[model samples]
Target: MVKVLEKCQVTPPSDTTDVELSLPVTFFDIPWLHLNKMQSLLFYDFPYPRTHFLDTVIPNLKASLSLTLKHYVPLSGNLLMPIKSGEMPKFQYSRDEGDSITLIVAESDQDFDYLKGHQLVDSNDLHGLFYVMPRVIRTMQDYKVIPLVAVQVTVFPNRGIAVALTAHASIADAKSFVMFINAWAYINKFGKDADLLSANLLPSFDRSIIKDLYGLEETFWNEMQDVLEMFSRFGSKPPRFNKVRATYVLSLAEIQKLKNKVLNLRGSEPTIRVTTFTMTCGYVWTCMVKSKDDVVSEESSNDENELEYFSFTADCRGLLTPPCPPNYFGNCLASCVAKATHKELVGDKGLLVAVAAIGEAIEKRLHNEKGVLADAKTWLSESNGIPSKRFLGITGSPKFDSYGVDFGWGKPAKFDITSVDYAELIYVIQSRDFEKGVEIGVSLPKIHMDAFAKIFEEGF
Candidate 1:
């Protein structure tokens, strides 16, 4: 069991109120407005004494965290969040209401190494690592007040350490969330100096840079209700049966082989830049959908005409008009979804079919005659085109180094993306063991996982 040692509410320095902030939700932020809370855990190898950890380590984190929260001051603020009923949207405010972020200090009696393994295991085993989120002050009128972000730090006595972060997706997207952690770790490792923070990756809260090309803000605002019921259907209740999670790796060597194999295939796009990300997506997308062969029911005898999609989000910091700062805070991302029939994706030529379709979708989104946001008008409506059956999505990017954050401790041994439990999506990241390899995380019912594991081992 993972037991809590302390629940310290960390706030920025007292004078930070002088730097108040209020950022409005934009078109890009609406899709994520009322979805599941994004969660991930990083396990580090720390075989040290628990005495000094509590006496010393906790204080340092508290101090660095307090300092880190200042840059993202609005995160600490208590703000209203949207629920249902087309409430337009809720804005952030940097008020002085004892605004604090939850920092849970804990220790677990479970096997630290086993908990971070790549093998299949019950996801509930790692549930203890997640800290309970602050209760909603009000869910009565299609709105509630919940903290933007919370961190859980669990030490394994003489075994290892686990660091987890759970945040409202509407508050910040994965990129923004990762950078926030990067900044926090940077301060914890180096001095709490402003020079490096400013010169390096500081938060850019300039919302004016996000131009609404087709007035997508209003388009998504009214269309927000369409997604309201989709997410509201899945409550925080435990699954009816046991759900097992699995991890697979495509080493640098394997990635090269797959990339070369796809390059030899026909129907390649001229401007399509095949990245390690797209290749990895193509590899996993076909495998998982094919793995669910038995479970994919469509009420009809054959699903040959049915369209199964593989949608992925792209970082639009530079893809946007006028281009924004590299450290642009908040959500700035767009999707590129590829589709094909079940027969095509589950057949022998599926990988070839999969790569070509995904490659073209991304190429056009990036190098189109009408820019990336050209599909903005049709995006929300088109998003519904993504099938309710056998849908697959990709989260996390290999571009961001998950192993880079070393909070005065050593680099993390493993990083677990717990939010992948919410859907059939696979979490992709650069491998911690190898330089160019990629890691794939997925959650499935035990039986399907057995099938996936079989295919993952023999099919490759």
Candidate 2:
């Protein structure tokens, strides 16, 4: 187990004066019912003594992070919700003294080489090594004042260093998260005087462009009331637990083969084109359902009524009516879901069916602008009575440029969506060494994991 060495609150270098900044949570941000704290760790092969790291590297990271936080003040801010009902949640930033981002400095004696190397590692072990944010409290009142982000920087002595970041999902989305990381890394590599600091990497904090034609914010508030009522009856808690996480890679060649296979399946009206993400997600989704079928009894496996669903969020910056800037800071995404029967997903043509379902889901929900907004209006209310047990969610997007994150030491060896343990979730990322390929992270119980691993290996 990793040992926590020390913890410090890193405040912005510029200000200590009390200043409060509030920004409204857009309609695109509130349809979901959960408080999301997205987490990921970056590994660096420092190859230096622990003393040198603590003295030079750690201080530099802290100072640079402080500088970066000055530009994006919300990182060091709090998420506030009015105690009164029917109030939309907003992010507040007050530069009060002692109010700063939490940075946990830690040390570990584990096998750093193996952990940071290009080898498969257990998700739980990997997570245990990095400090993670505690699960969010269930009540809205509990979140009246909460930090926007928590950061951890772990050292493996002479082996390597890993930087773990956890951000409130209410404030920053995946794109913004990477932008923050890149900004911090940029400031660390090239001092604060670098030109790239403000030229192309700055965040756009304007929320005025996002207009909610469907009143999604109010709808989401009402939905939360119902959710709270249901939870009060059974006590507020997540449904899944004791999940095992493992990372798998699909090489460029393997991805090409999968794409080719899909094309071959789609003969004449090849109009339905699929990207690397579409094909990779489809393969993993199909394999997961089949793994379940393999572990269950034959009598239960043949049950045709079993329905499986795959849900993923689409970046809606470009889909907005006026099209918000890609760098628009706050949440700007729409949640989407695709459904399939267990038997269909486990059949001979399952791969093709999976790809078609995902492809069509994207086309109808994401590609069609009108349909996208319409779905956003009703997603939360419709999802109320749906069973969450059979639902599988796709987390990270391969287009996030995750592998390109270099924090002066070198590019990250691995990246993980650490908060995926709460539910049955899988993440897709661009391969570290191989461009045009993808890395898939999956979490499951040990018994099902063994079957899932086999299906993933043989299928790939």
The lDDT leader among the candidates is 1
For 206-319, candidate 1 gives per-residue lDDT tens digits of 888788868888888778776766765565543443577688888988988877766665455454456788778887888887778755556554767678898888888987
Task: Please report how far candidate 2 places residue 89 from its true position, in Å.
Answer: 1.7
List runs of model 2 lying over 4 Å from the truth. 15-18, 117-120, 130-143, 197-199, 226-241, 267-270, 298-302, 369-371
Predictions in order: lDDT = 0.77, 0.75
RMSD over all Cα atoms, model 2: 3.2
Q: Best by TM-score, which number? A: 1
> How well is each residue in 114-183 modelled by candidate 2, as lDDT tens digits?
7764435666666665445443322355345656788888888888988888777778778888888888
Query: How well does each candidate superpose onto the true structure, as a TM-score?
Result: 0.91, 0.91
Q: Which ten residues in a row have the lowest lDDT in candidate 1?
A: 232-241
Report, for all candidates in order, the number of backbone clashes: 0, 0
Q: Worst lDDT window (10 residues) for model 2?
A: 231-240
